[PDB]
Every structure is written in C-alpha cells, then in structure tokens.
Design a binder for these strands. Structure first.
Ligand SMILES: [K+]
Ligand SMILES: [K+]
Ligand SMILES: [K+]
Ligand SMILES: [K+]
Ligand SMILES: [K+]
Ligand SMILES: [K+]
Ligand SMILES: [K+]
Ligand SMILES: [K+]
Ligand SMILES: [K+]
Ligand SMILES: [K+]
Ligand SMILES: [K+]
Ligand SMILES: [K+]
Ligand SMILES: [K+]
Ligand SMILES: [Mg+2]
Ligand SMILES: [Mg+2]
Length: 1326
RNA sequence: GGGGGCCACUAGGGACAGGAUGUUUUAGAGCUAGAAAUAGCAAGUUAAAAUAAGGCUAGUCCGUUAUCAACUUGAAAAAGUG
DNA sequence: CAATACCAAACCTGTCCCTGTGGCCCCA
DNA sequence: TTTGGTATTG
C-alpha cells in the first residue's frame, strides 16, 4: 500500500489530501469513541484544518513597555513625596493622604474631600487665584515670597509627572530667547561673506514672520517677499529654508557638482561633505542658520516674550487661558445677540459638538472647530475668531495633543527656577535641589533595559553592586559599560565558520581591507602584447590600494585604467574584467579617520592596527558620547584635543559577517599566512575567500570543520525568519503530516507535495509627504489627500509620480484618472508582480513602446532624468528605476525571460525551503552504505500558479466563497500534479525535490505542463497521445481518459474533513474603555475596592473557555436546591483562579454539589451536532457560530465560476453557450441554498428576504445575478454570522444568542485532521 | 550548481528607553424663582489618582506573543491509544 | 427568551539587532 | 476589519 500526501500551507488554513497510485483518495472506517451508538464512521482522506490568525508580539510589547512607564512615573512621584515627607508632615500631616484618595467618593474618603487645603474656603480661594496649574507654576517661578509647601509640591509634581520629551541633547535656552537676534546674526555673517552682495534686513520683522503659526514654506515666502531682489532659492533663501526645517539644495548657490541637500532633521555628514568643497569662511554661516532654526522651533512652543518671565511655557499656557476666556465671552455675547435660538445647543448640549460637548462631552478640538466654523461665518464680528480657528488657536485648552513638542528642558527650567526661589526658605529644598532635578531628568538608557534582578526574561542589565537602584545612584550601581555591551552582543551573531569568535564591526578597518582585497584579487586585465588575461600580483594589488583606495573613497574602473595602468604600466588601452563601473568595496573608515586625525602614516602603520580596531569597535559598540569618551580616554595621549573631540562625535552602526580570527587569525600550517595574507598575495592563483576556505591543500577548511559545533520542533519553527502566522501554519502542517502517517499504519508516503500561499495608509501618506517635500512640489498644497484615499491604486501612483505621466514629460489630471492606465514595467506575462514596485501610472500604455519587453529605448532617453528625480525623492525604489531603465542595458534578454518563466513554477522562497527541510529530515532518517541519506520520501515544492493553471485549463474551477473545501481540493491537486510531474520528468527532481540555450529552456519551462493536454496549439498546432508514459521506464503517468474523471470524482465528493482548530482565547481581559458608573453587574472593578456602581469600570470581558457545569443552584427566597446544566464562561481574568481550584470557584459563583468529573472544558469553536446533521460551534458561553459546510455540487460550482466571469474566441463562446444552456442552474442553486438554510442555518427572516431579493432581480443580467449568488453564501458559510448584500439589498446577520440547545446535543472532539472523533451525548447528563 | 562574501535598494520579525492625549471618580461652594418637575441666567480651559484584576520572586521586576481535540498512565513533563 | 442596534484606545519620538527578495561582481 | 458583549424593546 503506497500513497502520497498533498499539502497547502496558508496563514489561516492547512489543506491536506492523501492520494494513491491512480491519484484516487482513499476512504477508511475510523473508530469512534464516547457514549453514543456510533462505533465508527467512514471518512475520506482529504480535508483542511482552519484556525484563527497567529499574532505578532508587537501589541504585547507595547502594553508591557507602557506598563513599565506607568510604574516608573508612579515611582518618580513617590521619590518626590519621600523627599517632601517630614516638612510636609510639619505643614499638613494628611496632604499626601488626601492626594492619594482623591479618586474616592466622600463616603469612602477618610479625610476631608478638598485635597490641597482640607477646607472649602481655602480651596475655592486657590482655584480663584490659580485657575490652572500653570498660573501657580508661573507665580512660583517669578515671585520672591515664601510659598505654601503644598503648592510647591503641586507645581514640582506637575512638572515631574508630565516632564516633556528627551529628543534634544544638552541644555536649552543658550542665549537665544528670541528670533530677531539670530536672524540679525545670520544677516551679519552673510554680509560678511558677500560684501559685494549685501542684504538690507532693516525694517524686517523676523520675529513675527518666522514665529507665525504657518507652514515653513509660507514663512519662507513671507520673509523673502520682505527682501527685494532676493529670491526663495538663492543662498539666503536656502539658509532660511534650512532654518525653517525644509530640505533646500545648496548646489545651485555655489555652482556645485555634488548635490548639497541639507535638512537639519545624515546632516552632520552631509554638511561635512559639502564643507569639503568650499572649506574656509562658510562654516559659521551655517552655524548661524542652525541657531535660527532652533529659535523658530522654540517660538513654536513659547509664544510669549522671554524677558518678562522665567516661565515662558507657563506664561504661554496662561496666554491660551486668557484668550480662551476673552473669546468665550465674545462668542457668548455674539450668539446671544445674533442667534439667540442656538445658544443652548452650543453651550448646554453635550451630545452636540459645541462648547458643551467640547468641554464636558466627547468632542475634540477638531470636531468643535468643524461644528462652529459655519456658525462663525454666518455671524458678524467673527473674523478674528475665524483667523484663530484656521490657525488652530481658538478656545484652546492647556492639556492638548500637540503639547508633545515641549522638551523636558523647559519643564526643568521652570522646576529649577522654583527650587531656586524656595530653597531660600526651606533647607531641605536646598539640600535636595539636584535630587529633584535628577528625578525629572533621569531616563533609564535604552541600552540598559529593565532594572531586573534575575526574574525578567527581557533584562540583560548587570549591576556593579547589589542594592536598590535609584535615579541618584544609577551610575554607581549599574554597570553601564557591561550593560551597553551586552545590549549589542546578545543580538549580534557569531562567525558561522568559527562559532565562538565574535564578528567584526562592519566599518572595521580590517574588515574593509578584507572586502577590498577579496574583490580586487579576482580582477583581470588584458592589453595588446598579452596572450591571456592575468591576475594582479600582490605588488600590483598593494600599489592599487595605496594609490587609489587610500586616496579616493570610491575607485572607478576609469581611475583604475588611468591612474594606475597608464601612469604606472604605461598602457594606453587596457581591458578590465571582474569589475564594472566602480569597485563595490571601499576603505571608508580609512578616509573617515584620515579626515579626523590627519595622520596618514599613522593609519598605514600596522603597529597601531590594534588601537584602531579598538576605536572603531567602541564607536560601533556604543552610541552614548560620554561612554565613547570614557572608552577612548586610554588614547587621549595620542591625539590632539580637536582630533579627540572630532572622534567622539563619529559613530558607526552595523556588524560584519566574519571574525577577526578568521580574516587575520588562523594561519595555514605550511605557508604560515592568514586569510588576508592569501588575499593580498597568493602567487598566480589569487584564491578568494570561498576557494581559500575550501582548498584541501590548506589547513583553513579542517580548522573550520573542527571549530564548528538541540532544538525542539516548536523551537526550530519559532526561530525561523517569517511572519508568526505562517509559522503557526507550518507547525500545524507538521502535526497534520504526523497524524496522516499514523492513519496509514505508520507507513511513510512516497511523496509529499507542499505549496505555500502568497502573502498602511499612514505609511503611504508619509512616503508621499516626504517625496513631495524633498521634491519641492506644490501639488500637495493644491491637492490635499487623506491617508484612506491613498488606498486607491491610481491616486497613490498619481502622487508618487508628482501628478505626471511616467512615460511622457507631461502633466496629469486627478479628475481624469479613470481614463489613464496602470502598466507593468516588466510585463506581467514574464513577472507576475502586481505591486507598486512594478506598476506605473501613465496616460496610455501605448506610450511605453512595445508590450513584449521593458519600456523602449526612446522612452528611457526621454524620461530617465525625471525617473531619477522621482527616485531621489524616494517616490520610486531602486528596483523600479532599474526595471524602467533596463532598455539602456540591453533590455530583457532571452535568458531573462527563461528565468522569469522558470520562477513562475520553481519555488525559491526560503521559508518554503525550511518547511521542505523540516519534513524531509522528519521523513528520511536512515543512511546507506556510503553513509548518505536514504530519501524514502520525496518532498516536492510547487508554486500556486501550477495548480491554478491546471484548474483553469481543465475546468476544475474554485470559488472561495462557496465553502472551505477549496483548501483540501488545492492540496489534492497539488499532490496529483506534483507526483505526475516528477513521474513524467524524473530529471526535474533537482528542481522540485528537496535534497542534493535560453530559447531552449524558455520553450521547455513554458511547455512543461503540456503533457496533461490532448491537443496543444502553441505558435503551430500539435497533438499528444491519450496515455502519457515515462520515456525510459515505460511506466504510465497520466491516462487522459480515466484520470481526469478521477479528479472530477474526488472534487465532487461531499464529505470533506473541515476542522476548525479549537483555541482557548488569550489576550486582554476585556474592552479597554473605562465606562462611567452604572447600575449593572456587567461592570468590572478597575481596582479591588472600586465599586463600579460608584466608580465605573470595564465590561465586555473575553471568555477564555466555557465550562459545562452540572450542579444545583439555590432558587427563590427559600434557597431550594434545583438541578441545572448550563454553560459558565470563564473570563480570561478568572482563568487562573478557576484553574487553581475549580470547585471553590464554581461554588463562589453559586453552584452547589458540582459533579467534578462531569466538568467539560469547551474552548472556542467547540463542535456540537444536533438534529438533521445541523452543527454549531461555540463562539462563546452564550453565542454560537454556524458549524456546517454547504457541499455545493461541482456542476453548480463550475457554472457559478464561468457565469460570474470569475481565452480563445471559440472556447469563450463555448463557455458562454454552456452558461446560457444551463441558466436553470440559477434556480437550482437557489433551491440548494434554501434547503441547506432550512435544514441548518435556520434564519427564516433572512432566508425569506433573500428569496424575495432573488425573485426581484430575475431580469438582471446573468453575470450580475451570479456574482450576487456568490454573496448569498455568506448566509451559509461556516463560522460567525455576517451581513451581506444582494445587489442593493442588505441582509443583516442572524445571530445565535443562546447556547442552551448544545447542552443536550452531541459534543464532537476532533483530532487535528478530524479523522479521529470522540462524540459525547450531552443529553445523558443531568 | 543547493550555498557564501560584497554593493545599491526595498518587504517580514524582535527588544528596549521615553512623550503627548484619552477615559474614569473626586475637588474646583453655581445663583434666582418656584412645593416639585422645571424656567431664566451664570460658569466651563485645571488638578489628584488609576490605566489591564493583580503576582511573589518584592525587582524602580513580572502580568495580552508563542503553545492547546479526546482518553489511559503520569504530580507534571510526557509518552501511549483507533 | 428573541431581535436590533450600537460599541469597540489611539497618536508619536529615539537606540539597536536579525532574516528575506533581488538586480549586479566574484566564488563553492 | 470582524465579531462577541451590552442595553433596549417587546
Ligand atoms: K517602537
Ligand atoms: K467621610
Ligand atoms: K523679492
Ligand atoms: K472632550
Ligand atoms: K559594480
Ligand atoms: K553606534
Ligand atoms: K485571538
Ligand atoms: K492564543
Ligand atoms: K479609552
Ligand atoms: K548572495
Ligand atoms: K512597501
Ligand atoms: K463638577
Ligand atoms: K482540535
Ligand atoms: Mg499597577
Ligand atoms: Mg490627564
């Protein structure tokens, strides 16, 4: 008994089928367990496992980190309170107690209900004096009087609990404090550089213009209009644009070659690049520019002069409050006079988006502005209010979403000011000033992680001493060096060849020397007199490195031909091979360090090698400039302070893939030279890295094998590189294979054919914004778009093309997108790529050139520079540009077309290879006489296009919406096609079986599947035999008279084992919304003592799994015991408690005399069978999902495919004629559905509405009726009910809101395939 | 030629350090007429605390990813059963 | 009960690591 | 988005 297995791996399904020699699917009698009269059941060996999508760990990580942030903010507040404790107890012994219980109702409060002062008079007086906390903050910053210690604490705690961001390094307010001075300084340095061309900035109000709340380009345009004869793209205009945050191009200002694109948000290296060109005199000007940028950015936040207060942030918040009060008074009076009938709706109705809903309801600032703008325009005297509205500065709150701009240095400034003011009166404030400042300023460094003590699987921090870590002892306790080192080392891999040696930093001088020599050793050259191309000698390589690679960042073939061959070897003409255009490798770190230290002989001396290797290591291993300085301190005696200061600023990222002990460590026994020594000089062999480590005449290979040195199935799958969903699918696939082998008497299959399925608007908006602002285009200003709109392909392409045709240098129209074309760069007949990377928006595809290849040479000549512009704006990826410009490189060769066609059939994804390797190592385990693996089971891998084209060519159509059978059918067809293909052409095994002339292969791989067809009309016409056999063995592979009927019969089988994977629900406890208080037991307490009737809380908890409880409950005021059998849902939160002791939990819920052995655990999707084969699945403890599949006959499936328009003229006509001849199928299909629905679905209202809808549109075209019949199957689909639409009628989901019936139905436990069952008659309980 | 190093580019994962909102209860004395409903007016911008219940291992740590049909034997971890 | 309509926590900064696809150079 | 919880309405 022989057989093969077909598998179909997806993100939510694994289809499986077993085939025999005749491509038939067996059927067995499987034993049935339980308490029913059923002792066995007949099963076809075909089916599909279904499961919910596997989830990433991202949301869990975000929740975890936010948890930690909340804990540590609470800890900051606790630190501050511990500092204040004794003196606050002297002032008010219950202040912090009233603060802690501020949330409680007065009934539960143990102290007075007024927090700050404990009596109503002082509280109302405070609130009248300081209506916002920022009033108190400004008062405590400015005033000189001794203040109440409680108000001091309130200010400092408001600053610490909400402390602003840490994106800016260093300190703030360094001079500056105004824009006018820095604009004046920029004008002064400009006039210093251009005495002949000065700028008259007199009468120019830079403060208002550059601090005005307008777009950067608009403030640019304003300031430039203020200066006549100076344009926006001149030098001064570009400096002001750089200050405003734009990306100006300084190339045209200095007649440059290198594109001097500068954005102050790579800028250090970009500016050093540009500064290399015009070195002296031009650095201080850009210094002034960046300073002006900082001033404008701060003016965005501080909207009050900084000379009347040391609390400009609090003063700006008070400005917000005062303008809010004034504008609210004016708006109230205006509405009272002009539209008095609307006043109530605006100022009393929380449901509307007026001021009532704005302050008390749920309306946002945006919703309120939208609600009130029409009212403002309809009235008189609202022009200034509309100005403040369109600038988003009307009736502003102080606690808003845009406060994220506030850096922590400003809050720290106000905190330090208050501490300086009040430490004169409180000695403990003087002694703890820096402590409180540190509380505000201290972050745990990202390279340190959780400050754990051996109970966190996420932590890596090592501590210098065993004691509690505080913000003040962090450096003394935490080993920041070892922690920052472990941060990188636990994530970087080791040398694969030497698994114990760490890999080198990517920018290591040794590593780049290695790469350069390894590329250079394979270069070959020819001249006239030479008989044969020769390698470069060690001397020639050293000369090229010392002359070209050590004097230019990049070395072109031009530089190699001219600066070496002509100058040294005196070769007027030389032909170079092994390199094209320029060398890929380069000694970048060499030149970085040459610019920083300016001592070339130091860099060339090998004595300093180690030192240099360490420095780079430091610069790569750490990012904190202070730790970099501490590590480089041991070299402070070797470099001038300028060089050291320039060095500690230079940092590197990334790691190599080989170790230092591999490059320049291990040596060959006889030659005594390392790998790098071989790369530099190796006589006339010039062996490269692969050859060097694979040469048996050398000791490197055996040392690698000697140095080279257990995981479970789940561990191995979890460590794969892929999405977690497909990994869940892979694990389920392996489990299915194991169970299927057990079904076949432990016999291993002949073959296993596997196929793996092919696997945001904010990112599109970000791409388009960055590309357009890098492009300097006004199309975004003239055409506003929302992120959702970018889900349209043509509009996204329009904005990615700056509103132009791509094949012609002409304007495009948004309104005319329905008339334009979306073309494939490389034609889809070669590369089945439908992504934005291979698609393009043009006016007409005809303008691409010929449709049989890449865009023509003419279109390339015309459009290449526009394409490069779109590429630099990152509106085009490099691959898209290269496929567009392929024509200038020869276009598509015949080899390229052959490779594209082979790609469509031969799977080369790595994840599929890993699935194949797992299954292959699981099936084949024995070794032969030569100790080579015995391949009993051939693991074949196919691409979906094979079986797709098979279905379409032999009318084995699939319709996904009818049911889930198509997964199992795909697995079956995979098994059949794969086995038949490798039987017909065994030589293709190396292509399709895991383990170990362009026109010819094009034709071959195009016609690989023709052996299934009887006649093949490939342009002329040819025909094939009825029986297809192997050429050598003479064995039969395909009988076109009998085997196609076998496939039809297999696909028509109604009994297919569809199994929905039962899963305990995990995740959050309940819905996240904190609901207001309500008289309902559905509310869940947010804290142990917070009675939800008083404090509100959560509802809508998730049921981890239900439990069948058979027990008794008290009834009536008599508490009389009454036997019950019902479904109790255990919420996720309750699950641990319920599992620690189920009897105590159930008795706590009210059940008595619980029959402990009759407790049945029922996870989600638990299957129940009732009457007439009707099946339900457990959606919850109180709701059910549809549990039955509609096995629609194959004739109706193919009719629905063809009629709905889901080729040759004669064949299209034959299919249309078949559709019209079998129009009655329509009614028949309806009938089928109806019967199914009346037997299983039981939705009388929905079914009647659907029948009326079908009888309403009987005059509609057949195609439309068919594609609506496709929608109809949502009523009958397995799983959760859902709403659908028949033409323009909407059918709402009929839900199953009661689970009482399944308590007497038959519970079905299914193995992973569903072949093994256990059926429990629940009627026999209770 | 499965594989490997490099260069240019873009998809799929993982971890950590932080920010600004949101929500919830309470505090911010509403007034006047009315028995009451209710009417007329005034006011509104702020703060505290919580932000998965909580856990022990008590850390300025952990608490939403992964994994799970049933049954026998097992404390589990496991194997085994048609 | 049965049916119906409504509801659902979101945004952002920075540091770093990895594998993967895919055009090119060189090899095993 | 999809889909299970919730309060209303009979
Ligand atoms: K993040
Ligand atoms: K009380
Ligand atoms: K001008
Ligand atoms: K609101
Ligand atoms: K190159
Ligand atoms: K670094
Ligand atoms: K889930
Ligand atoms: K789960
Ligand atoms: K919320
Ligand atoms: K490669
Ligand atoms: K993308
Ligand atoms: K109130
Ligand atoms: K199962
Ligand atoms: Mg907590
Ligand atoms: Mg808040």
């Amino acid at each position: 008994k022989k057989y093969s297995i077909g598998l179909a791996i997806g993100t939510n399904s694994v289809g499986w089928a077993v085939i025999t020699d005749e491509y038939k699917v067996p059927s067995k009698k499987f034993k049935v367990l339980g308490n029913t009269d059923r002792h066995s059941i007949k099963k076809n060996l075909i089916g599909a496992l279904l499961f919910d999508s596997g989830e990433t760990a991202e949301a869990t990580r975000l929740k975890r980190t936010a948890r930690r942030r909340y804990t540590r903010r609470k800890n900051r507040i606790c630190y501050l309170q511990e500092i204040f404790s004794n003196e606050m107890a002297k002032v008010d012994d219950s202040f912090f107690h009233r603060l802690e219980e501020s949330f409680l109702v007065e009934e539960d409060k143990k102290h007075e209900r007024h927090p700050i002062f404990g009596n109503i008079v002082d509280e109302v007086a405070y609130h009248e004096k300081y209506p916002t906390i920022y009033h108190l903050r400004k008062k405590l910053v400015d005033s000189t009087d001794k203040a109440d210690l409680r108000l001091i604490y309130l200010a400092l705690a408001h600053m610490i609990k909400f402390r602003g961001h840490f994106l800016i390094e260093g300190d703030l307010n360094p001079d500056n404090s105004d824009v006018d001075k820095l604009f004046i300084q920029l004008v002064q340095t400009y006039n210093q550089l251009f005495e002949e061309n000065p700028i008259n900035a007199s009468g120019v109000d830079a403060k208002a213009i550059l601090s005005a709340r307008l777009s950067k380009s608009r403030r640019l345009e304003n300031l430039i209009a203020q200066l006549p004869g100076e344009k926006k793209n001149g030098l001064f205009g570009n400096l002001i644009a750089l200050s405003l945050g734009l990306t100006p191009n300084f190339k045209s200002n200095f007649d440059l070659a290198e594109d001097a694109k500068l954005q102050l948000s790579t800028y250090d290296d970009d500016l050093d690049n540009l500064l290399a060109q015009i070195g002296d005199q031009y650095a201080d000007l850009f210094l002034a520019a960046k300073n002006l940028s900082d001033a404008i950015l701060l003016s965005d936040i501080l909207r009050v002069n900084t000379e009347i207060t040391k609390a400009p942030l609090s003063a700006s918040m008070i400005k917000r409050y005062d303008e809010h009060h004034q504008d609210l008074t004016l708006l109230k009076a205006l509405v009272r006079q002009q539209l008095p009938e609307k006043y109530k709706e605006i100022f009393f109705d929380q449901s509307k988006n007026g001021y009532a809903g704005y302050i008390d309801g749920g309306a946002s600032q945006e919703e309120f502005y939208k609600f009130i703008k029409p009212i403002l325009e309809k009235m008189d005297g609202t022009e200034e209010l509309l100005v403040k509205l369109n600038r988003e500065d009307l009736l502003r709150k102080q606690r808003t979403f845009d406060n994220g701009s506030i850096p922590h240095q400003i809050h720290l400034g106000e905190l330090h000011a208050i501490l300086r003011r009040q430490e004169d009166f409180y000695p403990f404030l003087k002694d703890n000033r820096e402590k409180i400042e540190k509380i505000l300023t201290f972050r745990i460094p990202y390279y340190v992680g959780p400050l754990a003590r051996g109970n966190s699987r996420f932590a890596w921090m090592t501590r210098k001493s065993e004691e509690t870590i505080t913000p003040w002892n962090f450096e003394e306790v935490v080993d920041k060096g070892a922690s920052a080192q472990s941060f990188i080392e636990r994530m970087t891999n080791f040398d694969k060849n030497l698994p114990n040696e760490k890999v080198l930093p990517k920018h290591s001088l040794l590593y780049e020397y290695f790469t350069v020599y390894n590329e250079l050793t394979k270069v070959k050259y020819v001249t006239e007199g030479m008989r044969k191309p020769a390698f470069l000698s060690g001397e020639q390589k050293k000369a090229i490195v010392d002359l070209l690679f050590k004097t230019n960042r990049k070395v072109t073939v031009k530089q190699l031909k001219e600066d070496y061959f002509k100058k040294i070897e005196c070769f007027d003409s030389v032909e170079i091979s092994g390199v094209e255009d320029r060398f890929n490798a380069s000694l970048g770190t060499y030149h970085d360090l040459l610019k920083i230290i300016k001592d070339k002989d130091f860099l060339d001396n090998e004595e300093n090698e180690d030192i240099l290797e360490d420095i780079v290591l430091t610069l790569t291993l750490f990012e904190d400039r202070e730790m970099i300085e501490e590590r480089l301190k041991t070299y402070a005696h070797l470099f001038d302070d300028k060089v050291m200061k320039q060095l500690k600023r230079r940092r590197y990222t990334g790691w190599g893939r080989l170790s230092r002990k591999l490059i320049n460590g291990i040596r060959d026994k006889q030659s005594g030279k390392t790998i790098l020594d071989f790369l530099k000089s190796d006589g006339f062999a010039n062996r490269n890295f692969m050859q060097l480590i694979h040469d048996d005449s050398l000791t490197f290979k055996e040392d690698i094998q000697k140095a080279q040195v257990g995981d479970s199935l789940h561990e191995h799958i979890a460590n794969l590189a892929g999405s977690p969903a497909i990994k869940k699918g892979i694990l389920q696939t392996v489990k299915v294979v194991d169970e299927l082998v057990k079904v076949m008497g432990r016999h291993k299959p002949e073959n296993i054919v596997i196929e793996m399925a092919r696997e945001n608007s904010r990112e599109r908006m970000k791409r388009i914004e960055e590309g357009i602002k890098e492009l300097g285009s006004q199309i975004l200003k003239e055409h506003p778009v929302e992120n959702t709109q970018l889900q349209n392909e043509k509009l996204y392409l329009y904005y990615l093309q700056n509103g132009r045709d791509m094949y012609v240098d002409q304007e495009l129209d948004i309104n005319r997108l329905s008339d334009y074309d979306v073309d494939a760069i490389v034609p889809q007949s070669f590369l089945k790529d439908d992504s934005i990377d291979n698609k393009v928006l043009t006016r007409s595809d005809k303008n691409r050139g010929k449709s049989d290849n890449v865009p023509s040479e003419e279109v390339v000549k015309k459009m290449k520079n526009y394409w490069r512009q779109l590429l630099n704006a990152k509106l085009i990826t490099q691959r898209k540009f290269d496929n567009l410009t392929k024509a200038e490189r020869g276009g598509l060769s015949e080899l390229d077309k052959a490779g594209f066609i082979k790609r469509q059939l031969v799977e080369t994804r790595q994840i599929t290879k890993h699935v194949a390797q797992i299954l292959d190592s699981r099936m084949n385990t024995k070794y032969d006489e030569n100790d080579k693996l015995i391949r009993e089971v051939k693991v074949i891998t196919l691409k979906s296009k094979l079986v797709s084209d098979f279905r379409k060519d032999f009318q084995f159509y699939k319709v996904r919406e009818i049911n889930n059978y198509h997964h199992a059918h795909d697995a079956y067809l995979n098994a059949v096609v794969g086995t038949a293909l490798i039987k017909k052409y065994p030589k293709l095994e190396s292509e399709f079986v895991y383990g170990d002339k362009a026109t010819a292969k094009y034709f071959f791989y195009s016609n690989i599947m023709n052996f299934f067809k009887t006649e093949i009309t490939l342009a002329e016409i040819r025909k094939r035999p009825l029986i297809e056999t192997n050429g050598e063995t003479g064995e039969i592979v395909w009988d076109k008279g009998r085997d196609f009927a076998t496939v039809r019969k297999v696909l028509s089988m109604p009994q297919v084992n569809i199994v929905k994977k039962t899963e305990v629900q995990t995740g959050g406890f309940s819905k996240e919304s904190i609901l207001p208080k309500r008289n309902s037991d559905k509310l869940i307490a947010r804290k142990k003592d917070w009675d939800p009737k008083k404090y509100g809380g959560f509802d809508s908890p998730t049921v981890a799994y239900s439990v069948l409880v058979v027990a008794k409950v008290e009834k009536g005021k008599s508490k009389k015991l009454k036997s019950v059998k019902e479904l109790l849902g255990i919420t996720i939160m309750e699950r641990s408690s319920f599992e620690k002791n189920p009897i105590d939990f159930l008795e706590a819920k009210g059940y008595k005399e619980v029959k402990k052995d009759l407790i049945i655990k029922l996870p989600k999707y638990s299957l129940f069978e009732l009457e007439n084969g009707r099946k339900r699945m457990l959606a919850s403890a109180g709701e059910l999902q549809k549990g039955n599949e509609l096995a629609l006959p194959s004739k109706y499936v193919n009719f629905l495919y063809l009629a709905s328009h889901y080729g040759s003229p004669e064949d299209n006509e034959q299919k249309q004629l078949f559709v019209e001849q079998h129009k009655h199928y329509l009614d028949e299909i309806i009938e089928q559905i109806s019967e199914f629905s009346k037997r299983v679905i039981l939705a009388d209202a929905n079914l009647d509405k659907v029948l009326s809808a079908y009888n309403k549109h009987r005059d509609k075209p057949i195609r439309e009726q068919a594609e609506n019949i496709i929608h109809l199957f949502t009523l009958t689909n397995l799983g959760a009910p859902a709403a659908f639409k028949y033409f323009d009628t909407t059918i709402d989901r009929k839900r199953y809101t009661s689970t009482k019936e399944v308590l007497d139905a038959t519970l079905i436990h299914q193995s992973i395939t569903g072949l093994y069952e256990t059926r429990i008659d629940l009627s026999q309980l209770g």
